[PDB]
Design a protein around this ligand. Structure first.
Ligand SMILES: Cn1nc(-c2cccc(NC(=O)c3ccc(C(C)(C)C)cc3)c2CO)cc(Nc2ccc(C(=O)N3CCOCC3)cn2)c1=O
Length: 264
């Protein structure tokens, strides 16, 4: 839905992302929001504006909500839910020594719930990773920027040999054929579980992107992080079946994670 830009108050810079500058502010003085100012030439704006209603209607506690847009002016604005603790990857690394294993599992559950919801709506994230999860003031993890990778205009991001392509979160059928599906979000979720349980380590560190693609194509997988139990690793490992149809759904994954919680 179209937000009235007069209802927005810009308060602080939040840095830069794939679409340029993002600011912290408020909507009608009360609601904290992030406001993306879409760098001209960085986004396929027709495609995005054409297909944006569906994305505004995705509503779930564990999604970083898309409140609406401003399109009557340039640059266009995307206004989203504000998350005080920022992105999950930096949160993991900064709070690395505080987490108890049950909290790690709870973060995975947060994301899995969001992804079960997207799955049920046949909506793909396409770039699930700890950097594209955000954390609010109570430590709840939410999935952010789902589906926007489809509108990126940047050859370094959209080409699987580009320097910005999420190679380390991609299954073989994406790296070889660009076959995105629910099962490629599944693969990425397993890697995200690995990010959480490794407390923010980089997957395949010291491997290049091409070396990563080569070595996952040959069946090699991320090691079990120290803080992951056998059961937890079995869950993240099931996301990495070479053949996409052997990977679980997010409904099954959620059940697996709940089962682990019951047992503890
Ligand atoms: C919604 N939102 N968005 C951002 C934020 C800010 C800048 C850039 C971005 N990223 C993006 O816009 C973005 C991300 C991914 C994509 C693709 C297409 C999927 C690849 C496209 C655009 C984002 C995420 O959308 C930061 C938030 N929040 C914070 C909060 C605090 C801090 C922070 O500085 N700290 C330091 C002090 O304490 C910890 C938090 C940073 N970001 C926030 O709530």
């Amino acid at each position: 839905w179209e937000i009235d830009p007069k209802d927005l108050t810009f308060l602080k810079e939040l840095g830069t992302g794939q679409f340029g500058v993002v600011k912290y502010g408020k909507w009608r003085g009360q609601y904290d929001v992030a406001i993306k100012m879409i760098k001209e030439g960085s986004m396929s704006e027709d495609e995005f504006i054409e297909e944006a209603k569906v994305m505004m209607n995705l509503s779930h506690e564990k999604l970083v909500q898309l409140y609406g847009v401003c399109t009557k002016q340039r640059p266009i604005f995307i206004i989203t839910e504000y998350m005080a603790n920022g992105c999950l990857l930096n949160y993991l690394r900064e709070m690395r020594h505080r987490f108890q294993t049950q909290q790690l599992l709870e973060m995975c559950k947060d994301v899995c719930e969001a992804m079960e919801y997207l799955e049920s709506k046949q909506f793909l994230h396409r770039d699930l990773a700890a950097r594209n999860c955000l954390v609010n003031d109570q430590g709840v993890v939410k999935v952010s920027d789902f589906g926007l990778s489809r509108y990126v205009l940047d050859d370094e991001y959209t080409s699987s040999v580009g320097s910005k392509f999420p190679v380390r979160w991609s299954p073989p059928e994406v790296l070889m054929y660009s076959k995105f599906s629910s099962k490629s979000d599944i693969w990425a979720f397993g890697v995200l579980m690995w990010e959480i349980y490794s407390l923010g380590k980089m997957p395949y560190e010291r491997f290049t992107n091409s070396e990563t693609a080569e070595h996952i194509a040959q069946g090699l997988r991320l090691y079990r992080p120290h803080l992951a139990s056998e059961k937890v690793y079995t869950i993240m490992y099931s996301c990495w079946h070479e053949k996409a149809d052997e990977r679980p759904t997010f409904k099954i994954l959620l059940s697996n994670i709940l089962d682990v919680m019951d047992e503890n």
